[PDB]
Design a protein around this ligand. Structure first.
Ligand code: K
Length: 88
RNA sequence: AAAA
């Protein structure tokens, strides 16, 4: 599953990129004030669900990332996550 | 879901 994990990792890192975040008003509305989102919400996005429905592989893919941080069931951008949340 |  190593190649599939790499595709999932890079797809989710795109969502958490600055270039995406500047326009991704839905993602930012769903963040809590600390920048965290449910990993299961990310799992529902079309390009992730195309690759897998195995939540364990999604967690494994993201543990490897230098872009995002996992706390329990939630994920956020590591760099300055508090700048991005928006009102629901 | 214009890579939510
Ligand atoms: K919010």
């Amino acid at each position: 599953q190593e190649l599939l994990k790499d595709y999932i990792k890079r797809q989710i890192e795109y969502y958490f990129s600055v270039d995406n975040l500047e326009r991704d008003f839905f993602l930012r509305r769903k963040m809590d004030a600390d920048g965290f989102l449910p990993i299961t919400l990310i799992a529902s996005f079309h390009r992730v669900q195309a690759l897998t429905t195995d939540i364990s592989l999604i967690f494994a893919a993201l543990k490897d990332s230098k872009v995002v941080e996992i706390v329990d069931e939630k994920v956020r951008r590591r760099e300055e996550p508090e700048k991005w949340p928006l009102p629901p």
